[PDB]
Design an enzyme around this catalytic site. Sequence first.
Site, short mmCIF file in Angstrom:
data_model
loop_
_atom_site.label_atom_id
_atom_site.label_comp_id
_atom_site.label_asym_id
_atom_site.label_seq_id
_atom_site.Cartn_x
_atom_site.Cartn_y
_atom_site.Cartn_z
N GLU A 107 1.05 -4.54 -0.69
CA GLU A 107 1.93 -4.31 0.34
C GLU A 107 1.29 -3.32 1.26
OE1 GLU A 107 6.23 -4.61 0.01
OE2 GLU A 107 6.41 -2.44 0.61
N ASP A 147 2.47 -8.62 1.42
CA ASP A 147 3.70 -8.16 1.94
C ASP A 147 3.49 -7.31 3.20
OD1 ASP A 147 5.25 -9.61 0.07
OD2 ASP A 147 5.93 -7.65 -0.92
N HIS A 198 2.41 0.44 0.57
CA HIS A 198 2.28 0.90 -0.93
C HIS A 198 0.93 1.56 -1.02
CE1 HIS A 198 5.28 -1.72 -3.05
NE2 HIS A 198 5.85 -1.02 -2.31
N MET A 214 8.19 -18.10 -2.43
CA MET A 214 8.13 -17.04 -3.35
C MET A 214 9.47 -16.48 -3.78
SD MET A 214 8.30 -13.57 -3.84
CE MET A 214 7.77 -12.32 -2.51
N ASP A 238 8.54 5.55 0.81
CA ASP A 238 8.37 3.98 1.34
C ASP A 238 9.31 4.03 2.23
OD1 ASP A 238 7.92 1.50 1.69
OD2 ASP A 238 8.41 0.98 -0.42
N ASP A 284 19.53 -11.21 -5.93
CA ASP A 284 20.02 -11.30 -4.70
C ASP A 284 20.93 -12.38 -4.53
OD1 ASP A 284 18.50 -8.78 -3.90
OD2 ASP A 284 16.63 -10.32 -3.39
N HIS A 302 15.06 -12.19 -5.20
CA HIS A 302 15.02 -11.73 -6.29
C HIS A 302 16.29 -12.36 -6.92
CE1 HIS A 302 13.61 -8.10 -4.37
NE2 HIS A 302 13.03 -7.89 -5.41
N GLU A 311 2.44 -7.06 -7.83
CA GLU A 311 2.85 -6.08 -6.44
C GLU A 311 2.27 -4.70 -6.85
OE1 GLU A 311 6.05 -6.61 -4.39
OE2 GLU A 311 5.07 -5.78 -2.77
N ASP A 330 8.25 -7.49 4.03
CA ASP A 330 9.17 -6.88 2.90
C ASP A 330 9.55 -5.36 3.70
OD1 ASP A 330 10.71 -5.65 0.64
OD2 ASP A 330 8.79 -5.62 -0.42
N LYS A 345 2.05 -0.35 -6.67
CA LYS A 345 2.93 0.70 -5.89
C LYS A 345 2.49 1.82 -6.49
CE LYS A 345 7.15 2.15 -3.42
NZ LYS A 345 8.52 2.01 -3.39
N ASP A 373 9.20 1.28 4.75
CA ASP A 373 9.60 -0.02 4.91
C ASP A 373 9.86 -0.38 6.60
OD1 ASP A 373 9.12 -1.07 2.35
OD2 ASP A 373 11.18 -0.43 1.67
#
Lengths: 388, 388, 388, 388
Positions: free
Chosen positions: A217, A245, A220, A88, A255, A57, A54, A181, A287, A183, A257
Amino acid sequence: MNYQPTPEDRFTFGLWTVGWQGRDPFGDATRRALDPVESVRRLAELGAHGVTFHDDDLIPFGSSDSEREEHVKRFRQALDDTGMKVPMATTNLFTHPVFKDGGFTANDRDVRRYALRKTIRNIDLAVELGAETYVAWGGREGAESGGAKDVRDALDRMKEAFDLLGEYVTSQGYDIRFAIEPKPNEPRGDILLPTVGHALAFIERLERPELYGVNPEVGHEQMAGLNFPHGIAQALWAGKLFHIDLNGQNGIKYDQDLRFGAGDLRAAFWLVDLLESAGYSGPRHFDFKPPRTEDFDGVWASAAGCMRNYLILKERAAAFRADPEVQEALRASRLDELARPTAADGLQALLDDRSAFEEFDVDAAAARGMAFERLDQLAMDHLLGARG
Amino acid sequence: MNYQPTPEDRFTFGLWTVGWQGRDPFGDATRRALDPVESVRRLAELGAHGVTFHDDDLIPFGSSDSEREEHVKRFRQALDDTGMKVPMATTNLFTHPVFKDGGFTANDRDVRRYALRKTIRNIDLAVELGAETYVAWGGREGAESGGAKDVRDALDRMKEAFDLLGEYVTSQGYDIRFAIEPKPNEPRGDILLPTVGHALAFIERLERPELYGVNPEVGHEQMAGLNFPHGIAQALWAGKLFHIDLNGQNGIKYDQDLRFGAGDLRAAFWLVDLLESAGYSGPRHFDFKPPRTEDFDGVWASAAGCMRNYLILKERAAAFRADPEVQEALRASRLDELARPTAADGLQALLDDRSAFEEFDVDAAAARGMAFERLDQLAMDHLLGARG
Amino acid sequence: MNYQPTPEDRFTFGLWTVGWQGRDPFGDATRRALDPVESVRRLAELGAHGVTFHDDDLIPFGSSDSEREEHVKRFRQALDDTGMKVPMATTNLFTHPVFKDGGFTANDRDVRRYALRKTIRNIDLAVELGAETYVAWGGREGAESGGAKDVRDALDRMKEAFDLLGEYVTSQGYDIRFAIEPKPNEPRGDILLPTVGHALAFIERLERPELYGVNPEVGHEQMAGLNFPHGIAQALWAGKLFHIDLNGQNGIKYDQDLRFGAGDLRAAFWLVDLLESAGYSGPRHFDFKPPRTEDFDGVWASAAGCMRNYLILKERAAAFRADPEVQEALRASRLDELARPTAADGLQALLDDRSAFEEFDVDAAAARGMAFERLDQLAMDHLLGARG
Amino acid sequence: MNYQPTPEDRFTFGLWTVGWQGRDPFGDATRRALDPVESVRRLAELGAHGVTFHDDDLIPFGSSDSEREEHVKRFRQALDDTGMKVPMATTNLFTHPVFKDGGFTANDRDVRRYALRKTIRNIDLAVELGAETYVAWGGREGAESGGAKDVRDALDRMKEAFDLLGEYVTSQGYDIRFAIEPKPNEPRGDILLPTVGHALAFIERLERPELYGVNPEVGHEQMAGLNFPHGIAQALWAGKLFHIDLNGQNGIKYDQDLRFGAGDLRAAFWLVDLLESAGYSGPRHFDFKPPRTEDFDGVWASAAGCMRNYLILKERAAAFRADPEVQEALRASRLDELARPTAADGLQALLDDRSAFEEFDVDAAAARGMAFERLDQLAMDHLLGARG
């Protein structure tokens, strides 16, 4: 006869994944921050193909154009020293308090304009680094209450934003496509474009639909209790699976992950079976978040597990499809017939076909067993490596 | 100052609703069967506008062409004696054992052809009775296991079926449109086109998309934990809300089919607010089941409650929007700005606008409260009739 | 090196499982009825240890005392010819319309008395056939609306019923214990004693708690999104795991009753690991439904799969615990310390222990990694037979 | 005819509620911190009865014994100036990284001892401030993976901890009782003692069960899809409802902590009906979070809404029970009979009662309607203030 990954496997990780400090809604961080360069170096050693980021980041929020340049340069050198790619990139339109009511669909117009500028700026950088796909996760697009957001107006604002980004890339002559994406919820009570289906339908209303696909994802869709492999099949059917993802989720709840393979194991098997069968050639992006209980050794073990699990499932799925006993079982269950057109002979022929209604023996057809349980047990034996 | 319904309110009921005998997966029927004529007469007295049916509700399965004619005639006379209309009709492609693996997507090709013929036959009858919308609920299209259904092939078969039906109505010159009704699961482990979004995306891949819309059901979307009003907003946004099924559901579990108003009451309020605001003019159809604990008196009380609840909510929603204090609250929360374009000035102007990024005071924007809690409490007071 | 079951494995099946005709809330039966004698014979051949029944499964409802006798005799002969045992029996207090509002907690007192008599009559028969456990699943005890059932009064009626049954067995001198089977919902909107925990707490309020335990079902706890292995651990901890029902469920939705192993595969592994580690010696009972898509061949393949999957998981779990590398990993994660008392030294000692607070280095303790991800990946490798 | 609260209504708030800065797993804080003294003053003005706290809310972690004293003194003065009471206190055993694997059930023994000391220290302070109930929410007691926690050993450690705390209060002669607060998941993948039932069953295994009860939270039970009012009814039935946490939740997903009244409105009505009918006299505590979209004005409006909604529902529930038409409906539905013993005449009498079985007309009983839909619609009319 092991499962060691190589860059050929196209496994990628977000900087924010192995770099997650462990701060959750009920607790402080349990790990120190990682320098993006160390993550690149560590992942390369594990066999990863590349990383994703991102904007926020890579370049801390509020950084000066020069500091920004220093950050990018250092990052570049690391990619050069390791051979890691960046397939990406995405924008952080959810962390800063200014995006508390959304980015592209914030009720405040000035916030919406700012959201678009921040994205455009990172699109330029993503192209510079070689990214082919630009992901958009509208984490703050939604609401906790009914009168706070008029969804029709919000969708107009969402479409407006995406059309403008499409007008930008096409005018700059960039070779980059977008992937939405979905969610269903979290951090907002309800998020707009909650599933792969809502995202797919939305794309068909954009000015240049060809520039947009989805980035589904695992966790999600599972947060809405949906069948992930099925959602992916529909995305592939529409030719919109631009990226994916991977991670784990244990049902309908926050979530999690978890690393790929964890969560719903059978769904992961059917997912890999589908991606490999369909010939998906995009990145296998993870992810996920190594749980906060772990130290750095645990972080890398978690990252390595993601890839290991995908490789084991790929093997088991391949052995499943290649088993002659499974091929005969598929025919016993009529999967071969599902692939044949119902009426290639046409409407008129169908209407004149007495074997299709007037003389159709419904009882005989009804008594035919589908043999799905035998087929599913063969699938189970293969997954567990219990074919005796 | 009561809430008595009149045919002007466009409330409709399926024959299978008040006619549900109470048989569930764990128990026998608790009520005797109702003759479709008595249901028509009883509903008319309650203030209903019309009824809907599945072929198999009106003409028993396996009936001779003559018996069939007698059934239709009797039904017609009742509609004539009461002034009740039939705005929608649908096909039963789920009850008979022959459809155990689906109708349009059954692995057996001969079953698929039979499914199409049975539907076409009822389409003719639906037009004859004046229906404007033909609903399709693929209750058996799906699977309990992963290898039993190749979803890409299944979607090809699904598209093939819908295209053929579209070729039929257009060649017969019928003025009837289709509406796909999604459901995430039950009776199949996972059903294809599980939500409003998946259905909307699917329609855009049909040959003649203009002939197809959606028929969302309150409880179905709620079975996936989704926000029903939001799903409806997206369907209206796309111009695809051809029909709607109202009922109640208490979260993620089996399909309860409670009377409208029961289940998630706040969602029902926001639903009515949206339908009335958007000017939806189609039928307000109730697809519910009076619980098996009730006798016939209880059945009619349940049916009457459906309409009563919609009328009370319509009143409360109207008073909400008409309240000047609410109008000011909407402006305080910037709903007026959400309705204004983000960048009517264009891309280039946005890129040259320093107030949108370089000189944007992110901290000042961030500190602005959205005032959503005050607005939501006003909504609550209005719903409960507690405006003091 | 296969997985063939033998009566020594204690696998049992309900007559209602392989005998399920396939009738669901949206469809008619797809299979003819099975004669209980054929089920006994077929299961014996597959390697089953015994069968279980509801009164109404064995003796049709409304049967004369003589017809009843003929049915029991025939059943007995089959058990004799095959060596099959009957370790558990239960009552059908949910099918007949009279139980539409419950059996033990029906608002109608006369219905409650009838429910008790019907149960008592079958308890005598269960003892006669050698059953050691009598299960009670209050499928109709609950409600769809809030004012229909006062839960405090309902719990008084529930306790009254169970106390009376306890007074009966103890006065007849029977050696039979009861097991309450919880379920959160379906067929009622909400069922009383919805989970293993609610059932366990309820038992402690009965006059003779020692006569009652729980009969948890994999799918039931999963319908509330709960961790089944954890629920079982608490039941074992309390010494109340008298019996157990095995099957598969794919998350929060209607009760699927898939064969054991299907659904959440990782949960099944951890379940078998726990049952075998804890030395559970009761029956491994399968309460499942072969999907309605199957013919009789498919039914038996589904039943065989239940046992096969349990045997494969038992092997994998055993190899997991026996792996020295796993034993060291368990110590690395401090499972050995979790088993040691926190303060065997006592309260006063703890309060005087400066190393426990005043001089406790919280930062050093905090920095210790739990190493849970490495341990979980070893568990994964073992399950998939991927230990290289 | 309004709904203004007074301290007589016993409404209380946690400092951490109106003091929530808005930091979630995907975003930074949107509000500055509140000084506990300002919260006390602000809440008093709104009509609140008192406040509650976690040790770490009042005295920053790592504070010196003197700084600690200054913090307590300031807090005390504010309580004195406003007349606010402190009826409950609790410990923070979830925020600091040291509790990443739990407090009372951490695998590390030294962590467990530290957890107990930290709690004991705050118990002394809670008594000093006048608290009558001490809550325990084991937010970190649980796991994300199966081999990380042996649940039987964990429950032994959990029991050991609670027994030691019970030994402490009884030896100090404190008049304080404990209340366990269950939660099914979040922040851990699965939390131990996930629902009110599991907590109730656990308490019966403690050395001094009389010192422990439950502190159920509306949203927590709803995260498992359970009926909150029913769970409360069972807790009252067992005489274990020592305290209660009120808020709103929209189904199965992350813990929203919406203001009371929001979320499932009908469940809130039935909850208030039950608490008022049962004569619950403990505090009406709000454990909620004003959404991060709000500024301080929005925080107080959210807090005020909590109390307003409880007062409106109390009024509607009271009018419901007092309506003679509802009283007759309750009798029509046989709620009066549910309250009468099934067999006060005894076992032998029941067995000799031919009207209970041999001569029981099951068909006539079966045909009786329960009239639940009429009763529920009256409940609906009352809630919406639509009694015409």
